[PDB]
């Protein structure tokens, strides 16, 4: 319940990228996640020519919802806090990077960041599906919890 | 069963059927061969304090 945070990674100095490192690790291996994020960020730098934090911040705002349902006994479109917004955008970014069907994760997360910068793919389809579920139940309830 | 306790304290035909028992009871399984006692006699003689050994669970 305090939810303490982690230090920024020194290559791209932001606090969001180390949380993305903590999301793409699997079974504890941090260095494999550091190998498949940094060469993926160099692949987005060699594909679309701009800074990697600039194209990452314009793609992480397209995955980030403003509404979410909360199922009860029904679905209430409650406004979500920005920490839940950024972990749900990171969770949809990793989990809809992982079902893409390509070869290596520096070609699989990198193309999903390049599709999420231009509003394409399965992460922004999950944000649009959460927005259709939040406008389909907007006239149902906006008061329960 | 005191047939098997008197049976296992004898020279056998092979050298590797000489097996291990508790030396006060006749329990065949879980005999600690540092002590040559079973699971319940080691607990009972450690709770009476008649073996050198402490209960401590701070491994």
């Amino acid at each position: 319940v305090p939810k303490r945070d982690v230090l920024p990674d020194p290559i791209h100095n932001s606090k969001l990228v180390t949380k993305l490192i903590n999301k793409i690790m699997l079974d504890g291996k941090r260095g494999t996640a550091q190998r498949i994020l940094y060469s993926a960020f160099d692949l987005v730098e060699q594909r679309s020519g701009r800074d990697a934090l600039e194209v990452f911040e314009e793609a992480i705002n397209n995955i980030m919802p403003v509404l979410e349902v909360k199922a009860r006994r029904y679905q209430v479109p409650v406004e979500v806090r920005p920490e839940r917004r950024t972990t749900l955008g990171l969770r949809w970014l990793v989990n809809y990077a992982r079902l893409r069907g390509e070869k290596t994760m520096e070609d699989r997360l990198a193309n999903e960041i390049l599709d999420a910068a231009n509003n394409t793919g399965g992460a922004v389809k999950k944000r649009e599906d959460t927005h259709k579920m939040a406008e389909a139940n907007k006239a149902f309830a906006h008061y329960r919890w | 069963k005191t047939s098997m306790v008197a049976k296992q304290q004898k020279k056998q035909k092979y050298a590797v059927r000489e097996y291990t028992r508790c030396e006060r009871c006749g329990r065949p399984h879980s005999v600690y061969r540092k002590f040559k006692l079973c699971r319940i006699c080691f607990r009972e003689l450690a709770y009476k304090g008649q073996i050198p050994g402490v209960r401590k669970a701070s491994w």
Binding site: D9, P10, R30, G31, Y38 | -
Partner: protein, 125 residues
């Protein structure tokens, strides 16, 4: 000329020495290329040279065993922070505001005799 701090985290103890120089971390007198696996994340151990940026000019020469590599590198951070405490006592608030000086008592927890893998209760049907 020699600031002997020590520092430990998570079964890994670092005996650092601070001699003045340009700056070169030699863990077991080798490098920081072959010893520490993460080339990028050796900035955990270069945190009291960047939080306390009065000077980033300190040769740390360090010979200790224990642990793995990451908690060993946080012990390099704890040894460099305790050696920067004993090098100058006015750095104490500057270390103490940014964490970096607690021996954090998270060690590897001790395995419970009912549970299978140290609070990994073995699957009720």
């Amino acid at each position: 000329v020699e600031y002997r701090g020590t520092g430990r985290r998570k079964n890994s103890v670092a005996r650092v020495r601070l001699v003045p120089g340009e700056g070169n971390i030699t863990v077991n007198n080798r490098d920081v290329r072959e010893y520490l696996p993460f080339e990028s994340l050796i900035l955990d151990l270069n945190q009291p040279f960047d939080v306390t940026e009065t000077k980033g000019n300190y040769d740390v020469l360090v010979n200790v065993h224990g642990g793995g590599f990451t908690g060993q590198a946080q012990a390099i951070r704890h040894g460099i922070a305790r050696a920067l405490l004993e090098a100058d006592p006015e750095y104490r608030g500057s270390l103490k505001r940014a964490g970096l000086l607690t021996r954090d008592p998270r060690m590897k927890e001790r395995k419970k005799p009912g549970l299978k893998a140290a609070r990994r209760s073995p699957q009720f049907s």
